[PDB]
Amino acid sequence: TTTLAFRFQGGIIVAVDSRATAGNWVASQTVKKVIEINPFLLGTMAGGVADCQFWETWLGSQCRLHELREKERISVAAASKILSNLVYQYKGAGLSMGTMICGYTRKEGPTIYYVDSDGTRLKGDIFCVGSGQTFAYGVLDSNYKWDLSVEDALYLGKRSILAAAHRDAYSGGSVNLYHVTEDGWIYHGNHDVGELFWKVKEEEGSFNNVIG
Amino acid sequence: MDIILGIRVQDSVILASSKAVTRGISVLKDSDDKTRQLSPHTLMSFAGEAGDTVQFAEYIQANIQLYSIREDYELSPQAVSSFVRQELAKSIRSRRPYQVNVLIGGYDKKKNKPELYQIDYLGTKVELPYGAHGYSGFYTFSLLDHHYRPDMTTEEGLDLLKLCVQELEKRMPMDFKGVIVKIVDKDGIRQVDDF
Amino acid sequence: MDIILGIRVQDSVILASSKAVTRGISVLKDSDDKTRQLSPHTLMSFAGEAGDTVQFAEYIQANIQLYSIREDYELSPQAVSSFVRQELAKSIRSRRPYQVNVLIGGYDKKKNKPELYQIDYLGTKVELPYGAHGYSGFYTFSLLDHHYRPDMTTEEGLDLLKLCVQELEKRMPMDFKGVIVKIVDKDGIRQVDDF
Amino acid sequence: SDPSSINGGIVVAMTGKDCVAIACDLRLGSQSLGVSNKFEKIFHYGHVFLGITGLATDVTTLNEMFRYKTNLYKLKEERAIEPETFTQLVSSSLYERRFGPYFVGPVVAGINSKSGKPFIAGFDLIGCIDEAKDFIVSGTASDQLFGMCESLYEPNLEPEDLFETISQALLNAADRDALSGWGAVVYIIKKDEVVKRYLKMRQD
Amino acid sequence: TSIMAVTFKDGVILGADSRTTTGAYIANRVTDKLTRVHDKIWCCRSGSAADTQAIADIVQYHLELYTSQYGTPSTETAASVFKELCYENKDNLTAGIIVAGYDDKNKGEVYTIPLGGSVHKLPYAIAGSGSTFIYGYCDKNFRENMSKEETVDFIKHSLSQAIKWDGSSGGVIRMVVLTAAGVERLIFYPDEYEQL
Amino acid sequence: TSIMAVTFKDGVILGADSRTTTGAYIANRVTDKLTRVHDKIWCCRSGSAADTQAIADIVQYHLELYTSQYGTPSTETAASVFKELCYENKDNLTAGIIVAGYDDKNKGEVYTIPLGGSVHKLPYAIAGSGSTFIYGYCDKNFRENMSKEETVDFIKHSLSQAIKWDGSSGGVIRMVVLTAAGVERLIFYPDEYEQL
Amino acid sequence: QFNPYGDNGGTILGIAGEDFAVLAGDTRNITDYSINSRYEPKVFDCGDNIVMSANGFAADGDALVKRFKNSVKWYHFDHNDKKLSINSAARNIQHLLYGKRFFPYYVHTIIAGLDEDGKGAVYSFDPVGSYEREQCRAGGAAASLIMPFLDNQVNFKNQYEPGTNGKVKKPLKYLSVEEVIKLVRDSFTSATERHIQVGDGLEILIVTKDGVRKEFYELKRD
Amino acid sequence: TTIVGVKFNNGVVIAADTRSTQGPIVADKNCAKLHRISPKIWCAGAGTAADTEAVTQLIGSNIELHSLYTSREPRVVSALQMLKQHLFKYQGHIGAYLIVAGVDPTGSHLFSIHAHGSTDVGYYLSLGSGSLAAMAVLESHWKQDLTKEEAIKLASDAIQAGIWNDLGSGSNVDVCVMEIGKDAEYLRNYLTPNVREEKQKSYKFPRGTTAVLKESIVNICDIQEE
Amino acid sequence: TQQPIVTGTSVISMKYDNGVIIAADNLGSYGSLLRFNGVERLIPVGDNTVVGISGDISDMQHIERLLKDLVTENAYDNPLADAEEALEPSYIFEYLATVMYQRRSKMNPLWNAIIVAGVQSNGDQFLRYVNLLGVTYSSPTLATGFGAHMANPLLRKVVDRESDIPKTTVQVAEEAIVNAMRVLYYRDARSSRNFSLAIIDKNTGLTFKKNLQVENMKWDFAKDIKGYGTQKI
Ligand SMILES: [Mg+2]
Ligand SMILES: [Mg+2]
Ligand SMILES: [Mg+2]
Ligand SMILES: [Mg+2]
Ligand SMILES: [Mg+2]
């Protein structure tokens, strides 16, 4: 798995791979690793697939109940903390979760929270989680600026997953892109890594090591 | 030890190797050179279990230096790397194996080509444009995949290497106390004293 | 997390706490504040198992803030530290104990004295002139034993703290990404933004 | 931990009409980390071809060993070794390491130069010969390869049809294995011409 | 331990050795393994001494309370109470109990309850570590409707052999005779049974 | 396994069941556990079938070579060779062997060699998993200087009980009679011995 | 020590067509190297035009299917005989499976039917309830043998159009129910050849807007 | 694996299935389990397949040299003694479980050999994962003084029991008949009750379906003259 | 979690044209010790069902009591207890199957393998298996333990599939069962010669046979077998 999310001028970019494995066996190449908690919040999936799915859908229900009771959009801080407090109750039981709770509200602006099954809850500008996180970090760190355009930021996130998909054996399949704005997230398509690799190699001149 | 990198450019091989030596809870040294010159145009960096690393490197060094004198001739990097691989492949089924990973950077004076070989403690050899051992590759290969070109100059290779070291210094938990960089080209081996 | 230091000088308590959050292979953050203000003149730094650290700190924070409102009165650092110790001493024989070590730096407005308490996850409390948790002490205590005076100014305390951090940065294997320093005195709590 | 699945990779061999095909991926990894996309697993000694999956250091070692042995064979015998004979040599060599084996999955393929009969064979790490008529599979995606080969294969394929079958068998099996892929090579072997083809596949 | 219960013409007789061991040390060489849960319902105990004593005490309580309400319980009823305890608490018990009793309607009856908590009604039963050595002898020598004197000889000879071979068994051979006539205790010393 | 060797007036008789088991599966129900290391020196095998066969073969070799040089070996000599192998290789063997033989000078002799590799000369010996159940019976029923017919009945009845109780034992009862007259093999089928 | 789990072998296969779905599975039931039954139905009609199979440990498989069928029944009682849509059934199953997250139903569950637009639908579950709508999914013992074959023959993976040489992919044309059934049968014939736990019989349930239809085929019995 | 051996009037017959497996996967669907130790001494093997093949070749090689040395035809007891002493020495680590059968100047013989080195004599024997299925048939139908045709029938029926009921066994029945005063007749694929049915579809691809990057001729020939 | 102590071996059964046959030996083993020789392991429920139980005997006796209790309970307020609302094999099985799976799910199993043989109200044959894991399956032949490995192969030669059932007579079926019981006596080290056999026929009802013995055994060939290879005498 490779999931990333980073804050920038135009909001948040979320990018994830699509592969799911059971040992060496590639169980699925079409896994949806971005949960649409609601039309304004996104969650990423790493570690336990079920654990992430179940509890981030549940999170959506809690967020919905909040705004029904409070007549106001839930904050990213509050939404993330509902999830982190929940998994902390299950600490030790064997839940496996690494997720970014991504959102854009009025009072906070664009906000990302790394939430962990050990109970870790961190706010930050750039996060990368999964077996291929290190590869994605390399591309992100050397190319990140706050004043990226929505177009360039989307590409950077896509390229960073591609980097990981290539090298990390347990990452691949396809790249899902999202762009989070204050008026809600915007899906930017499913991109097959097989086709994306050859496209990027030619246009960018990168991956000179690989023969195409 | 920890991080050893290698990159083969147009006309040279560049090897970057960490300076830290840690034993337990203390960094005993911050200027350790994890490399041995096997021959005038062949350099070997190394990382693995304490003691075994230097013992193996110097043992290889001695054997190549012995060959050099006997034949009055420098072995090709390919030949040296094959000799090294066999020693490690012999080692892995021994009573106590050498726990040593190496990079062999050499300039073949016959073909006029730089050559980088990555060999692990099992005796797994691969010729590469750029290589690493341990966790180093996890951070650096994404950058190298992106930026690397086969026609890069030595100066460009160093700039790309700086970007790799910067990433490592940002995301690695261990303080490896910077790297000693060495260039292997047609004129031999030299050290970049400012990095 | 990793390194948390504390030093009580003439008229203040200074707490230094690392900025790194390293989960496994990667350093996820290099600006993490490992501290919570329990009351206007009481600061608690913390280090231990992931999740438990912040959960415990905020739980304590809430309880002290609750007390403050109920009585319209700030508890003395000694009282807060005793409350914290009991919670940890209760915790150690629980089904799943809080794996959290803390330093409580407070300025007692009644006695006009700075006070530093070191409490570990077992509920072992000690009042000290300077303290540390984990491996931090193993170096810094020799420096603090040598240089520390009870009449030191806040500026001298910071200089001695810099010397402790420099030693850690030299001899510790882990890159803890510097420290966030906070001063607790009669005027309350403030952060030294350049360190 | 499991030596046969540290480096990853696969080999597949198929018989056709007056021809054999042997193919392999190009991946060498350290578990999850992809290290090399040029690590070929098919070697040849004269007209006999050997594919080897498993622990890469042994793959290399055995190749060097069989080159060594087939070269001496040729000097003494004054002829190139045949697939049937080489198969027995592989079996003998592996079993001599019965209680300290090479962690490999060798696959022999070729055409007997005298009879013109296509020949393939496979082995476990310890030397047991699997002499199949139809196809041989080996590597971390052997299950996937068995499934592909069993359904795709049909006897007496022509060289350029066999190429398509073996290629699609390898490719789709590798794409369902984390430790296989990163390129692929296919050898189409006839009695006196061999064609080597690098395949375009997904690089993840 | 070597224990056995044998039915005969006039009723039933229980037999037992008297050795209790802690490893190779004989903690008690004059143990009474023949225990009374009712007037004419007795049992032989094997396995954990704590467990079998705790069980027997509970059974005796249950049969005393039964008697107060419903009159004299049958031997089958006693065996059922033993079984209920042994079966339901099989994970925490190491008990091998032979239940023997005399009714006037049913006469002599013997029930054996091995480790699992199963119940088996038999003409005679053997149990304890020393029983293994006398399966052959007892099978060859047992007859139904023996006289009192014959049954005493059968038990005495059987337990003599069990004692002879089993180090865990020894001491005196205790016996308890259950008939219409009443309850008779018998004891036989080493000098008597060793020379058989 | 149920094996035994019994000395009597005219010599010695070896007895054995015929069951070999792999766990609860009977791999062979007609095994010959009575094996010949010399003309009138035989043995009964219990324990590892591989070990006891390997041992017996080596012993047979040693006694054949002995005979070539020094003439007919004594039964004691055969037992000593068995012991030397079993004792010296005690860490790598699971073998329980009864050695029985007939001299004209010494007549019938029986030696038992348990797991440890010790030697014990006895009037009769029993061994194998099924022997546990007949220690009582055999001790009660054995007499010295029995006739051939009495000894055959003693062994047949004993192994019948061993077979009856031991699941590891069963099949046919093989016997080998060693006397001055020569070597006689006997076999007794389930329908015969089960009704005893 | 008592092991509450067991492996009853078997293999299942779901394929979503354009206006139909199939859920197929072999009828062999096994433990270790023994055959329990040559005909033990594994794929079930659960009502509301949904078919289901929980492959793996048969006791947990039967338990789950039983509980789901029950859930369908109670959905009718509680919600005025409303039809349980395939997506709602999927979400419901997730909660059944995750309900035993810390003592899982040791099964790989697949359901098949039609979505609310009348298109074919297959859903696939892991033992602890993670699920996804898929076009194609094999499950159980021979899943690793069958899926690559389906990637190639259903989704035309690694297949390109002759003459273009890798430039133009083979277009993803829709398959008919007669075409799907051929791929199902060849998958199970191939799986029977190379997998010891697969054989005896193949039972295919076909879901269309008209209802559920069954088809049975003999497989090799060795 | 299912292997059996059945004595009869004037000789012995052995038989075996033809499925070799790697876990639950069938590696070879037509494996040859009937090994030749010498022309008239054959054995069938179960367990570690390399060990069975290796140990039969070794003993078979030594049996041949011995036969040449002594100017006599090899005996089954020699193969038996050589196999058991080899296997015993390796204390079961050589996982060879064999049914050894043959005819020699002494007569006809039938033995079994386990991996630890123990051997057994019998008129009917079975080994391998399908031995219990086979033995059930042997115990139901075997009798004394079987004819050659009856023994072949019994043997192959016992193998079939394994094929159908044991998952570790399958495919075909191999048989070898060793009769006294005759050549042994190896009957490869004596029965064939498991032929795969015709597939529904042909999966022959259109030429040019696979994407290619590079082509080249491989030089298999030696260095050329001139 | 426990371990079985006093154990019962193979229960074998098969369908035939008018009903089912089930059989099981009368042995209660205590490990390798053949402790109890008079244990009845076939337990009839009404006149249309026989439950055959293998595995732990103490748990069998518990199940036996549950079934006895089930009959009592079914008769309560039930005027048709001996007619339309009598217990069916399918009811008895499903009840047991529920219990077995619940017990395994509490990690405290009834250490048994059970075969419920009977004939339903409509005359249909009922034959289904359940064990300590709660695993259930049905087949024309069913067997537990060693019976699975040795009896089934023999019984499947008579009824190899569903269509063979109407061709099989009670005499052929009983013969196969009795032969299977002999084979198990030859080869199962935890079996006994004495066994019980039950026939549940839709016409003649329940026929329960006690004190049957394995007969016509072949042992004579043992006399010729000598040594383990080279021995001649
Ligand atoms: Mg919460
Ligand atoms: Mg990858
Ligand atoms: Mg402290
Ligand atoms: Mg106790
Ligand atoms: Mg005593």
Ligand SMILES: [Mg+2]
């Ligand atoms: Mg089969």
